[PDB]
Ligand binder design. Sequence first.
Ligand code: CLA
Ligand code: CLA
Ligand code: CLA
Ligand SMILES: CC1=C[C@H](O)CC(C)(C)[C@H]1/C=C/C(C)=C/C=C/C(C)=C/C=C/C=C(C)/C=C/C=C(C)/C=C/C1=C(C)C[C@H](O)CC1(C)C
Ligand SMILES: [Ca+2]
Lengths: 221, 42, 159, 81, 743
Amino acid sequence: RPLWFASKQSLSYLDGSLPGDYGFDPLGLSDPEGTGGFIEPRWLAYGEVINGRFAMLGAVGAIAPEYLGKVGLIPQETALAWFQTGVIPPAGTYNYWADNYTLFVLEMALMGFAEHRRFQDWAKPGSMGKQYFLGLEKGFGGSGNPAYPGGPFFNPLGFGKDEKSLKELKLKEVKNGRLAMLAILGYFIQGLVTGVGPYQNLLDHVADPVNNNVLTSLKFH
Amino acid sequence: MRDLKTYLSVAPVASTLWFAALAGLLIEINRFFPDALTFPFF
Amino acid sequence: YQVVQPINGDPFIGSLETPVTSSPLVAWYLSNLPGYRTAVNPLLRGIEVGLAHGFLLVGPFVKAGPLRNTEIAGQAGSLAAGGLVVILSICLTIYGISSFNEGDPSTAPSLTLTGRKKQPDQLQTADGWAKFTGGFFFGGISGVTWAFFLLYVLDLPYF
Amino acid sequence: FIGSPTNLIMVTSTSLMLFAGRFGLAPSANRKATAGLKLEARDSGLQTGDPAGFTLADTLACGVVGHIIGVGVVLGLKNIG
Amino acid sequence: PEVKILVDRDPIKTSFEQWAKPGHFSRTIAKGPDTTTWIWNLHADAHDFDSHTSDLEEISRKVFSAHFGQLSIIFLWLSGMYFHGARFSNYEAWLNDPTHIRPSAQVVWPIVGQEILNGDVGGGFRGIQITSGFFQIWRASGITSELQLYCTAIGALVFAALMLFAGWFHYHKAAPKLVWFQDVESMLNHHLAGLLGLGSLSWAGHQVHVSLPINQFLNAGVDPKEIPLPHEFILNRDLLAQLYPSFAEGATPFFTLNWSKYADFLTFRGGLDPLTGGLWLTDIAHHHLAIAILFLIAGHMYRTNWGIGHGIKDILEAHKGPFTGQGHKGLYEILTTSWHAQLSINLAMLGSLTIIVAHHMYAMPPYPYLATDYGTQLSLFTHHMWIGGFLIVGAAAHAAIFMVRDYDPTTRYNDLLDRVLRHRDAIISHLNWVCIFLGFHSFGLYIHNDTMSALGRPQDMFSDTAIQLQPVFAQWIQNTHALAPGTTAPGATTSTSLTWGGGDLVSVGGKVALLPIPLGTADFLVHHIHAFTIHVTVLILLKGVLFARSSRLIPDKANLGFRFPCDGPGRGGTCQVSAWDHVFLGLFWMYNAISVVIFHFSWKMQSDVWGSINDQGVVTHITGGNFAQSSITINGWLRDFLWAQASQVIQSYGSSLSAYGLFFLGAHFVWAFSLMFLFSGRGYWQELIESIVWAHNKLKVAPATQPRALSIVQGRAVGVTHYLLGGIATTWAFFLARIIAVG
Ligand code: CLA
Ligand code: CLA
Ligand code: CLA
Ligand SMILES: CC1=C[C@H](O)CC(C)(C)[C@H]1/C=C/C(C)=C/C=C/C(C)=C/C=C/C=C(C)/C=C/C=C(C)/C=C/C1=C(C)C[C@H](O)CC1(C)C
Ligand SMILES: [Ca+2]
């Protein structure tokens, strides 16, 4: 196990029990000394995993539509950049079957039940497999570890029945999650100061590298 | 609730609510019967 | 190294030793003044003091007076200085009368700054003070007259 | 505009600054300052990779101050000639 | 050694248990009350956290969350201001025509005939003319609609909610501990670089994109509703390129270091905008940019976690010399264990800063259409002067509290503090002499002038025509400033103000924004009056601080505590021998000083600067230079200033300025009322309450909480607070009524 820009204080609380543990904490935030609200190390690990998961989702999803916007029957009205979808109205909207506000409140009602149930499981672990939920509670039990609940829903294919399987798989998961997180950050800043869209922008970069980051030095918009 | 009822009856809060009610009453009375220098009914 | 020390090294007397209070030249200067000339007859010290004070009192009285614009500015202001010096003598004589008596010794300290005996300064007696105030008044009128003689009586180029 | 105009002045300034910083010649992250005359050796705790004890705080610090001296020299020279 | 976040979980559970119990913090209070004095004590020691306990951790946690509560109150106040400007204002009408409509953002309900206060402020609007200068701020920020004001009000409302919640959170859920507070290196690093550096950089960013183009459009004469919305100026860039051509290159100048290509909107002009009567916005933006760079570098001085930086202890204990022994050794330990030391330092600095702000804002008006809004100018200057004075007095109060409660040479010894305590008598004696000399040679000149004038001898008077006392140093300095632009500040075109000189009068809408202010003999006299008053209040406060622990009068004054009535009528009488009593006087003398200062400002401005310009350039001032000849004797102040200026407020009745007349009289009343508490003692009052209590007991209507007269200290406190309220309020009414009627 290799270490990057470690700290003696940081190394103490980062010995390796967590996946992706590279001892990198130059600002010392997972210190089990000052654990209080939202600074406790378990919560920070959970947050890294969940952010990485949502970022993997959103990072293959934001680049998707404008890729097959070039290949296949997929029309061009269905082929937006990730910022023209209506997320940022002053940058482009669309007309779905709903209003983009009812869309939002329906989205957040559904996400509300899913997120609240997930939190109810983080706090008192194993509480969601107790109350009735149109059946389906026997599958929402959990596994003691919040970031890795398992069960018939969140692990139907049964990957990693031994635990070095789970070890290296968790390592791969958190590594791809970090990759997707900084990918999304690149998406954001690049779509701002270049304002093109990542897929199409990547194609312009592969034409030939004349168009370097400095070239859009000038902040077109 | 019981303690909130208690605190809402402490002297400063009891008196501010009492005087606000009294002020409202007097304000409305003079809004209906304005400019009254005497008792003109009987 | 520290500059401020307790007085004579005694840290329980209510004062200190600093540059303004106790640096070589300022001590020599203060000691060389008539008031602190202990071993000198009080009349001559009063003379020196009175002459210096009298001369001074003429300066502002004349220039800042109500007759400055008038031709008798010099005569007027000098006369005012004479009135003031005489008033100062009255303050001095009555002070000496109230605070001293002939049959009593000098209230001045007997010790010097090193702990040696020394004759108590005679200016703090009754007739020591009387001789001093007589000299002061004589010197004060003489100083006013000297300063009043210089300008006006004689052209003598000033300002 | 690279290696011809003010780019050379900005490089020589910053380059020289962190060349000093990595070696002695300047206060460190591992070198404390006595009175601007002598420098003691200390361990700031944060781990280094560089053999001479050159940490990231050090690279950023001397890079910044080299940038600022470079900015000053550039603006002054272009303001008087 | 290293710095980290260190917290404690749920130290106190939120609950309504202690609300039901009055004075839970004080053991004696908690039990209950025997007399009326208990109620007064409950309030007097509510926020004295360092006496409810002795733990520094608890004191600092309480302090942190109380600061959060105060921030929430401030945000609620701001949101109220913005909402009133959005809903009950004539801000858009004023925006259409600034120098004819009077700003007003408060209307009244027609209940008892009070709607007369809804005066004609113009613009199809009837309300109460406001002096807050908020319209000028909103115009300088680029706010053109009331939708923007509504959005601002709601944003500040949710910010107040956030602040209140954070206050609850950081005291009942996650409260930091002592080692987190006692870290001042990182705290300073963050307040210099993060709060002031990033704050001013962010504001410069705002002005570059919002205020500069929108104010350009407004000054070009465009109808406020025909102006593009600010976000357009960010979306479409050629909109900015039209007004400011060098927005075309777009930040490549910032990295080529061809910063001169930005000379368009980053100027160093100085002076005023001849159109708006305010500073050039392209100057204010450049100013905040430079300020940001300076603070961002400055917040990198102190060492926190990475070796580089400065240990404050090292800097302090490196400074010492042959006059001061081991000075500054031990101050770091003093300034990190006592909140009162920090509080008094910060209070002194904040008061100094507030008064500097008042001066600089009167001299270099920063907002458009502010200079020619005389009411706003007068009110802003006066308000900031008062705030500064009060803060400066509080500085002394808390220095004395420190000396009494937290100073300890056994465990926390500092050399300089000790030396000053050891020659306090020399200090106070020389300050005494300076006060006497200054009082004789400044006010004595006024008395001499009064008698010289009453004896029909004006030639003998200290005036501009009889005996000149010219402030040659101030005249020399301001002539040096007038000659500065081009000679010794080559990059400036106009001098930094117009009070320096050079001619160049600037007017707006037929009213005088600014012109060179002349300094004559009256200025000399009144400046020395200012020096005198400041020196005397400094004497009182410094004497209170230096003699707070002990004196030659009572040898154990610290055991009696910081605040107490006396120690009996012994040794001749020891009335008010405590440090708290010294603060009580300083407030009286601070009142005197600030009153004279604001009177000087108001008269001098109404006499030599403000007024109306005309077609030839003939300036008729509010008073035709009556300050240069009438201000040199006290009869001139009583006649030409108070009696003359006072007529406006007296005739206010029967108009919309009637409330100012009412407040004039009411403030006179409450001021006179204070004298009952300031001249009497509590013995007479206890003896009178005795017989009143008899009268009640005779009818079975006596209360159980036994009525006591106020404490000796409380009586003085009631007397000083009423006095200050009365005086400040009568001056407030006079100033406002006069400058709104004549302005
Ligand atoms: C018989 C005499 C009389 C009577 C009955 C009234 C009656 C009234 N006057 Mg009037 N007045 C009078 C004489 C009188 N006046 C005279 C002689 C004058 C001349 C000086 C005036 C000048 C005058 C003015 C200028 C105004 C009034 C106003 C009013 C009205 C409301 C006052 C008010 O709402 O306060 C203020 C109410 C509030 C500030 C609401 C706030 C509610 C509470 C305080 C909120 C506190 C909770 C808060 C959330 C706490 C913060 C905690 C936080 C941490 C969460 C009211 C009907 C006002 C008016 O007409 O409204 C437009 C008004 O502007 N009067
Ligand atoms: C860039 C970082 C930063 C910033 C911007 C601030 C800003 C502020 N601090 Mg703070 N502080 C910091 C770092 C910072 N601090 C650090 C590192 C420490 C030591 C560990 C402290 C310790 C500290 C103490 C002890 C106190 C402050 C206080 C204040 C307030 C001063 C009053 C004022 O000027 O009102 C200006 C008003 C505004 C600027 C309005 C905007 C408010 C914004 C939203 C504040 C957000 C900044 C905050 C640090 C965000 C982090 C919290 C996050 C987890 C949500 C101010 C808002 C005083 C205070 O608490 O007041 C309640 C005070 O008592 N600070
Ligand atoms: C950041 C500023 C600041 C802060 C945080 C403090 C904090 C503190 N001060 Mg303090 N002080 C300050 C500034 C400050 N002060 C200034 C500027 C002055 C000069 C006036 C003083 C002078 C001062 C004195 C003399 C004393 C304190 C004391 C105290 C401590 C207890 C205060 C208390 O609970 O009394 C309770 C608060 C009140 C009873 C409020 C009284 C109401 C005021 C007087 C009326 C104001 C009228 C209002 C503005 C308009 C009229 C409204 C009406 C018509 C409805 C406390 C730690 C006391 C102490 O013992 O320290 C340990 C102490 O005696 N301070
Ligand atoms: C480590 C550390 C420690 C030390 O001590 C210090 C430091 C250094 C500071 C640190 C840090 C670093 C970093 C860099 C971080 C970062 C992170 C991130 C980036 C995250 C993200 C993260 C991210 C995320 C979540 C994201 C997500 C996203 C998403 C979902 C998306 C979505 C979408 C889509 C699909 C499309 C559409 O159309 C739109 C939308 C709707 C938009
Ligand atoms: Ca921590």
